[PDB]
Amino acid sequence: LHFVDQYREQLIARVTSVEVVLDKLHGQVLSQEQYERVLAENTRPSQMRKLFSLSQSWDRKCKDGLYQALKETHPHLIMELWEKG
Amino acid sequence: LHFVDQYREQLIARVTSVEVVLDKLHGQVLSQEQYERVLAENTRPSQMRKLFSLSQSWDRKCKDGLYQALKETHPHLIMELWEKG
Amino acid sequence: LHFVDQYREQLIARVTSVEVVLDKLHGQVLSQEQYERVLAENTRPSQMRKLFSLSQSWDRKCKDGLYQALKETHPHLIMELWEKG
Amino acid sequence: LHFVDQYREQLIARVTSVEVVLDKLHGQVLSQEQYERVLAENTRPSQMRKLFSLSQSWDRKCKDGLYQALKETHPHLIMELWEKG
Amino acid sequence: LHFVDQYREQLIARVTSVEVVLDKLHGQVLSQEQYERVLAENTRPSQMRKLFSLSQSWDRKCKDGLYQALKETHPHLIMELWEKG
Amino acid sequence: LHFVDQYREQLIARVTSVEVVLDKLHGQVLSQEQYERVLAENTRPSQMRKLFSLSQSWDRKCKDGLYQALKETHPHLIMELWEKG
Amino acid sequence: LHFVDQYREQLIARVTSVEVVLDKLHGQVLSQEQYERVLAENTRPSQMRKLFSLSQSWDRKCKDGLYQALKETHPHLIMELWEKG
Amino acid sequence: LHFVDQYREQLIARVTSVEVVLDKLHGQVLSQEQYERVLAENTRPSQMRKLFSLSQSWDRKCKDGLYQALKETHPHLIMELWEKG
Amino acid sequence: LHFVDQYREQLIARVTSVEVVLDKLHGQVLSQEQYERVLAENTRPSQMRKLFSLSQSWDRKCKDGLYQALKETHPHLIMELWEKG
Amino acid sequence: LHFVDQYREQLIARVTSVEVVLDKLHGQVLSQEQYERVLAENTRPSQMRKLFSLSQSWDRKCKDGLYQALKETHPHLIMELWEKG
Amino acid sequence: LHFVDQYREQLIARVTSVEVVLDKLHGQVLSQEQYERVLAENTRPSQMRKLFSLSQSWDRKCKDGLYQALKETHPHLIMELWEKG
Amino acid sequence: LHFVDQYREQLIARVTSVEVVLDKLHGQVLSQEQYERVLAENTRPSQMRKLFSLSQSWDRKCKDGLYQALKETHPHLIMELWEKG
Amino acid sequence: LHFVDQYREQLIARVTSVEVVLDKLHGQVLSQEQYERVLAENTRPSQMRKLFSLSQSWDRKCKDGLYQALKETHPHLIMELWEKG
Amino acid sequence: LHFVDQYREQLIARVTSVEVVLDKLHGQVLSQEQYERVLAENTRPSQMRKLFSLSQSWDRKCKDGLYQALKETHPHLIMELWEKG
Amino acid sequence: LHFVDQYREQLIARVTSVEVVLDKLHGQVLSQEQYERVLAENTRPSQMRKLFSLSQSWDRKCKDGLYQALKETHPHLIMELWEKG
Amino acid sequence: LHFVDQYREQLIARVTSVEVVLDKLHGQVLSQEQYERVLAENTRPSQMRKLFSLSQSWDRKCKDGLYQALKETHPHLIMELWEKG
Amino acid sequence: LHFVDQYREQLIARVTSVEVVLDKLHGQVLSQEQYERVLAENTRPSQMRKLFSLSQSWDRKCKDGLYQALKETHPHLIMELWEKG
Amino acid sequence: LHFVDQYREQLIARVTSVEVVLDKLHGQVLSQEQYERVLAENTRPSQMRKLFSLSQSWDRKCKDGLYQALKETHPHLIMELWEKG
Amino acid sequence: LHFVDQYREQLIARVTSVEVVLDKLHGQVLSQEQYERVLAENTRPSQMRKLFSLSQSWDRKCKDGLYQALKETHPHLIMELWEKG
Amino acid sequence: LHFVDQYREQLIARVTSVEVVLDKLHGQVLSQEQYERVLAENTRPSQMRKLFSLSQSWDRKCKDGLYQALKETHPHLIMELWEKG
């Protein structure tokens, strides 16, 4: 199990600034079409859910990329998750 | 339950000088992008509401930071809330 | 039949300041996700409609909570509805 | 039909000193949040338009209140409207 | 074919002050809900497009009303369209 | 033959503000589940088509209810249909 | 008989925020494919119905998991069901 | 068209002693708040511009009042404008 | 209801020497930033209005402070208000 | 209407020895700060105008005080005004 | 083979401002219902894909119309495609 | 291409006294509402940008009017632009 | 890879004066509708993001145009990016 | 971290003579448009905040320039900040 | 708290010979521009208020300098303040 | 770069007799409205700053005119600037 | 069958303002002599009856004209008739 | 059933200020003799009872009049009754 | 219907100073003989009644003249009538 | 078909100021001899008829010239014709 898959629900619920993470991911991991498609969702939890629906293909490296993106944007949330573990 | 979550509605309604609290929070707790995004709202209640929409990620420590910021700016409001409790 | 269900259409049409009622309801009755989801709608009638789509689960107590929220925000509208009854 | 609804466009276009009418209305008819929200608009016609968007809830009594506020501030405009009728 | 349907694209592109036309139309032709819904769009072309999406129901009389509203607000644009014809 | 069945295609094509009619119908004629199900359609013509697929059960009284709802929302369209008759 | 099987119809009808419950269930009880498949349904009652069609395999433990998920999301609905019992 | 609206730009540019005209207008046509607000502008052209922004409400009678005020203060300017006509 | 909230409009309209009241309030009740911000307004009624927009946070004690400040500066106005009561 | 408000313009224009009236008013009606502030104006009409801008707060008693001050200083002007009445 | 069919994938991927092209096409080539249906899609690539799903009926003339619409909106993209050829 | 459209950016950047040009344009080309709306912008470049956003409707004649207004106010800037051409 | 695509995230985050770049781009590269649409976004990062969503169509030449626009407005940022490379 | 970013809040709060620093910065670091835009703010803290919103692009060299500007204008404030460090 | 901040209002009200204190402060504490700017105010209380608006930057040493300047110019006022303490 | 743009800050700071330069410039380079507007500023540095804000339009010839005006009024300052160069 | 012939009796009985319809019809459909002759009848039903006696000659176009005239004058009656149909 | 007849007992018991309601009703609904006769009762409940004994004749309009009178005098009681309903 | 014909009875009853209105009307609308004849009546209501008996001939223009005369003489009565409308 | 040829009869009948249009046309389109010859006619319709008899030679460009001349002289007539179209 990964970190992102462990607290999948937690990330979906409590991640707020999703646009920044997407922009961090865009190009390196997220195709333009996938990026816009996930961006097209209305609510932030919905955006996260679509992101996670698009995470199936990703290898361990890409999950690491997303983790890097999240650690940068929301260090506190990441701390909360590690504490929960 | 926290103090900020307890009187969420009260803070949203009756907090006025929001820019100062944001500047207090900026850097320590609020990213530049989140700070500007919350600042971009027109009305003060709207600014507070966006701030609270951005508060999901925050850990207990960050809620404490915000409490410190509010106690400094509006001691009287804080007193009113404690009395209500 | 309730009061909110009686004049469902009337509330949807003629309620304007919906954000305040939501903030009153948030936490006590409305989950963060449901609150944001209903807030994500563009027009006020649309926001009300989503709110009413989310009202199915609510017990009599929660309908009472919403009634309290509306009576506080729009006493005049509430008076109009009672007169119609 | 009311007087305010009859010449809705006329009031939106030709009412200038809107702040005074709002202050007259504030408390009695306009909540603090609604008052600030309508005040937050840039142009006077925009302020009027927001005011009219917030007028849906108002009962006949509140429309009368607004009429009183306008008759006091702009007697001449009121005369023009009656003549048009 | 009408005038509004003839230069549908032209009106969508080159009409700027749309709020005034809406206020002219509101009540007589546009319901409060339709009026707000069309107003809820961000860009002026988008507002026009929504207006035209709402124009399907309108009879010849209502298209005439809209034409009157546009001729008043933008006489020059109307002249350009007639010249194009 | 009814009025709604006569110009079934016309109503499906040229009715735009469908949400309002549904809200008018909801409770009195449309069950919550049927209401949401018809609302779940993407395009307005699709919403109308689903509404008409759900109209089979309706008695003359319910068709009258729908007619009332449409006459209120789109008087002009109703006029066009009567003229066509 | 279980609680979920007792008020199967009630849960199908009156559960609204289904996405959250699914996210709570995903991983622990719901496979990714089953989760997406149930999510692919249009209406919330349809989503619930598919969820219940997928509940056949579940052991008592998994029904308990779902109950936990529902009690968290919709405490009021759960109360209504117990009262009905 | 009026005289004041005809040479609106001319009056804005070439009227100098604006305070006297305001004092002539104050009470009869200009509310205390409007009077001070127009007086609060720095430059004379700015004062005139604000005055003209406040002239929308005025009826023909009030435009006549302003004309009287200007004819008294600046007979020469009035002569220049009539000659231009 | 307070005294300041009772005659909110009256204070906004008829208070003139606002700078002195602010200086009386500065430090004890008004932060430096709030003080300057309210001072930055052009007209005295505007200054009062901003002051009242900043009065939301204030507790009963602070409203009393403002009352003290006003009673000192404008005893006559205070008398007029009490008589009105 | 008062006497001072009736011939406001007349007093502003034709009162010359303003310092004496101020000294008569100082203490009883005019605060030291208001007195100096009105005195700080350059021209006599400007001094009068500032005095009248400061007259909003004054009760009937204070307007009477000012009238007494003017009757003493300029009996002839007072006679002219009564004749005009 | 046509130009639009040649670079079907390219147009679907890299066309951005799709609304304008639709408005250009609406009436001449696209029925109101087809226009709205293609507009109802969320993402721009999805809108293009629906447009291409609706392009089966179109004759060479209509494909030419679409080409004209695209050449006007995105000359650069058209250049890229010709270069690829 | 016009002159105003040619050096659109140049006019936006280097035009300073915008109020005068607006007053020149007001009535003949700019509606009262459009005039105030463009005036409501804070910075001069912003005012110009709004003016240019409102220039879409204008016919060649109105662009000529604006050119006349600019040539009068800023002959030097006009010379610079012609030299650039 | 281009320069703009390389530091896409960096440009989105750290570009501030976006209006000027747009005005530089408008006409040559950005259509009026695209220009207004990107301008309609609230925050500067959002404006940049929309700009980048609209950059898909652009050929190498247009990316060069944007680079020119950015180098002119923010030479320092451009230097930072080259150093990062 | 820089010095300006360290005490961002402190500089925003306690810097007073901002115009001089801007004039020092104008040309070398601040574009004319950015300079005017930051100058357009009402209050000094607001001016500083806008300045800091415009500081994102700036390289280390430009932050040094601003530091030089501040050290010259307010040596004492700079001393206070170093002591705090 | 300092002495100057303690009796801020008292100093603003009752300090008269302000020019001398400024000249004492000029060079050592007050920049030429700040000195002239504070001198540019009309009334002495206004001059003091501007001085205090410029006192934010000052360190304890500079507040001491101002205290020295005041003790020299108005020993009696200083005595009154100490007695009040 | 020009001479006036080179030492923009120096001219703003150290130019004192600004009225004379304006009178020299008035008519030839400065419109009456611009002249009064720049004159309306309180402090000399502020007057210079407004003058420089109005200098954007000026061609090389007008900058030369201003240079002539300054060389005549303040030869010594001009010498200091050349030495600095 | 036509609409006027269908509800001939209904129109004869329940049409009241007949003069207006005649004036609408006069010239286009009704000769001067026929118009006066139908007008010469005493009672409104008699006028209608004579009108219908004069309707024999009328073609479908003229019956349409009369329908237009009636729809304009008595929309409600027209609605009643359509409902009866 | 009416509102007054529904809570007849409640109104009889809990209405206190009866004289005011009578004065409101006198003339419009209550004859002088009936008014005095109901007033002649000793206790307030007795007065109400006599009022209700005199309410038999009243039409729906008069019951509405009484409701208006009560809503004005005792809004709180009216709220209690609606809640009971 | 006109305004004078609407409240014919009201004008007859509540108009008092009738001679002034007649003098205003005499010459323009009222012949010398008609003027004296209406003046010959004893009571003011009788004078009004005769005036109204003489109003049959008057065209819309003359009814407007009378309205002007009444609005000037009795603005309050005119206000009462408009409110009644 | 052209515009002038479409409403040939309308222009002949309803154009009044023909001399001005001729003067506009003279030189550019109308030879001196043709101009005088058309001018030699007595009545305005006759002048128009001769003008139209002389219009046979004119190319599309010259018909455009005449249209320009007419639009300038009689904008209202041109509007009437477009409406007729």
- The rounded distance, in Å, linking the Cα atoms of F71 and F24 is 12
- Count CB pairs under 8 A between chains H and J: 16
Q: With an 8 Å Cβ cutoff, are C32 and B56 in contact?
A: yes
Please tell me the distance from the alpha carbon of residue J59 to that of residue S81, in angstroms, as a whole number.
34
d(C-alpha Q56, C-alpha G24), whole Å: 78
Asked if residues S81 and S10 have their Cβ atoms less than 8 Å apart, the reply is yes
F–C touching, 3+ CB–CB pairs within 8 Å: yes
Give the DSSP per-residue string, J43-80: SHHHHHHHHHHT-SS--HHHHHHHHHHHHHH-HHHHHH
Residues of chain F whose C-beta is under 8 A from some C-beta in C?
19-20, 23-24, 26-27, 32, 36
**Alpha carbon distance D12, D28 (integer Å):** 21
Residue A56: DSSP 8-state: S
Chains B and G touch (3+ CB pairs under 8 A): no
Report chain A's C-alpha Rg in angstroms: 12
Cβ A56–G32 below 8 Å, yes or no? Answer: yes
Distance CA G17, CA G70 (A): 10
**Contact indicator for P75, P15 with CB cutoff of 8 Å:** no
Distance CA K12, CA K51 (A): 9
Tokens of G76: 């009021």
Closest CA relative to residue G80, chosen from G14, G1, G2: G14
On chain E, the residues whose CB falls within 8 A of the CB of C13 are 32-33
Radius of gyration of chain B (CA): 12
Who contacts R7 (Cβ-Cβ below 8 Å, separation ≥6)? R81, R84
Please tell me which residue of chain K has the smallest CA distance to E12.
K23
Mutation choice for M interface testing from B36, B39, B50 by most M CBs within 10 A: B36
Euclidean distance between CA atoms Q62 and Q55, whole angstroms = 9
The residue of C33, C56, C61 whose CB has the most chain G CBs within 10 angstroms, and thus the best one to mutate to test that interface, is: C56
The two three-digit tokens of residue L30, written as one number? 């700019």
Contact, C26 vs B9, CB < 8 A? Answer: yes
The SS3 call for residue F26 is strand
Q: Give partners of N (≥3 CB pairs < 8 A).
A: B, I, L, M, O, P
Q: Do chains M and N touch (3 or more CB pairs under 8 A)?
A: yes
Hey, are the CB atoms on N26 and P5 less than 8 Å from each other?
A: no
**Rounded to whole angstroms, how far apart are CA atoms L39 and L18?**
9
- Chain I residues with CB inside 8 Å of O55's CB? none
Are the C-beta atoms of P31 and P57 separated by less than 8 Å?
A: no
Do the beta carbons of residue M69 and residue M21 sit within 8 Å?
yes
Is residue M14 within 8 Å of N57, Cβ to Cβ?
yes
Q: Can you tell me whether residue O28 is helix, strand or coil?
A: coil
Which residues 6+ apart lie within 8 Å of K66 measured at CB? K4, K21, K25, K29, K55, K58
Å between N42 CA and nearest CA of chain B: 14
- CA dist T23 and T16 (Å) reads 14
The tokens describing B62, both together, are 């960050």
Whether the CB-CB separation of B29 and B58 falls below 8 Å is answered with: yes
**The amino acid at T76:** H
* Amino acid at the residue O76: H
- How many whole angstroms separate alpha carbon I16 and alpha carbon J30? 12
- Shortest Cα distance, chain L CAs vs residue D50, angstroms: 15
Nearest chain F Cα to C4, which residue?
A: F27
Contacts of Q85 in chain F (CB under 8 A): 85
Residue identified by tokens 């993001």 is M49
- Determine the distance in angstroms separating the CA of J14 from the nearest CA of chain O, rounded to an integer: 25
Is O47 strand, coil or helix? Answer: helix
Answer for the pair R63, R2: CB distance below 8 angstroms, yes or no: yes
- Determine the Cα–Cα distance for residues R51 and R65; give it in Å rounded to an integer: 13
The contacts of residue A4 (CB under 8 Å, 6+ apart) are: A11, A55, A63, A66, A67, A70
DSSP state of K7: T
Chain I, nearest residue to B16 by Cα: I54
Q: Side-chain half-sphere of F5: how many Cα atoms within 13 Å?
A: 11
Question: Can you read off the two tokens belonging to residue B59?
Answer: 């850990």
Q: How far does E29 lie from chain F, in Å, by closest CA? A: 9
In chain M, what residues touch A26 (CB-CB under 8 Å)?
A: 8-9
For an interface test with C, give the residue of D59, D60, D64 to mutate (most C CBs within 10 A): D59
DSSP for residue C42: S
Q: Work out how many CB contacts closer than 8 A connect E with T.
A: 4
If you ran DSSP here, which 8-state letter would residue G30 be given? B
Interface probe for B, chosen from D30, D31, D36, D47 (most Cβ of B below 10 Å), is D36
Write the single-letter amino acid at B57.
S
Q: What is the identity of the amino acid at O18?
A: V
3-state secondary structure chain B: CCHHHHCHHHHHHHCCCHHHHHHHHECCCECHHHHHHHHCCCCHHHHHHHHHHCCCCCCHHHHHHHHHHHHHHCHHHHHHHHHHC
Q: What angle do CA M68, M73, M74 make, to 5 degrees?
A: 100
> Of the candidates A33, A37, A40, which has its C-beta nearest K13's C-beta?
A33
> How many Å from the N-terminal Cα to the C-terminal Cα in chain M?
12
Q: To the nearest 10°, the Cα dihedral for K68, K71, K72, K76?
A: 180
The Cα of J54 is separated from the nearest Cα of chain I by a number of Å equal to: 6
Kindly report the number of other CB atoms within 10 A of residue I23's CB atom. 24
Give C20 to chain B, closest Cα distance, Å. 8
**What distances in angstroms separate CA D50 from CA C40, D78, H57, I41, M79, one per listed residue?**
20, 20, 19, 23, 46
Burial of E73 (0-12, 13-18, 19+ CB in 10 A): buried
Instruction: Look up residue A53 and give its two tokens.
Output: 């629906």
Contacting residues for R42 by C-beta, under 8 A, at least 6 apart: none
Contact N36 L13 (CB under 8 A): no
Q: CB C36 to CB B53 under 8 A?
A: yes
**Minimum distance, in Å, between the CA of residue M59 and any CA atom of chain E:** 25
Cβ within 8 Å, pair H33-I45 = yes
- Find residue I30's DSSP bridge partners: I26
Beta-bridge partners for C30: C26
Instruction: Give long-range contacts, CB 8 A cutoff, 24+ apart: Q57-64.
Output: Q58/Q29, Q60/Q2, Q62/Q29, Q63/Q2, Q63/Q3, Q63/Q4, Q63/Q5
- For chain T, the first-to-last Cα distance in angstroms comes to 12
Give the pair of three-digit tokens for residue S2.
């006109």
Residues of C in contact with G77 (CB under 8 A): 57, 59
Dihedral sign (CA A48, B42, C49, R78): positive
F11-43 b/e (C-beta count within 10 Å ≥ 16 → b): bbbbbbbbbbbbbbbbeebbebebbbbbbbbee
Place of tokens 């009926």: K57
Query: Is the Cα dihedral J69, J71, J75, J80 positive or negative?
Result: positive
Which residues in B lie closer than 8 A to residue A77 (C-beta atoms)? 57, 59
State this model's resolution in angstroms: 3.7
O40 chain-P contacts, CB cut-off 8 A: 42-43
User: Contact at 8 Å (CB) between O81 and O7?
Assistant: yes
Determine whether the interchain pair A19/M49 forms a contact, defined as Cβ–Cβ distance below 8 Å.
yes
Chain F partners within 8 Å of G13 (Cβ): 32-33
A56 CB neighbours in chain G (<8 A) are 32
What backbone torsions phi and psi does residue B30 show, to the nearest 5 degrees?
-100, 125
Dihedral sign for Cα L56, L60, L62, L63, please: positive
Nearest CA-CA partner of O23 in O35, O15, O13, O14 = O35
Structure tokens at T17: 């100021």
**Distance (Å, rounded) from C-alpha N76 to C-alpha N78?**
5
Exposure string over H20-54, b if 16+ CB within 10 A, otherwise e: bbbbbbbeebbbbbbbbbbbebebbbbbbbbbbbb
Residues of M whose CB is below 8 A from A36:
53
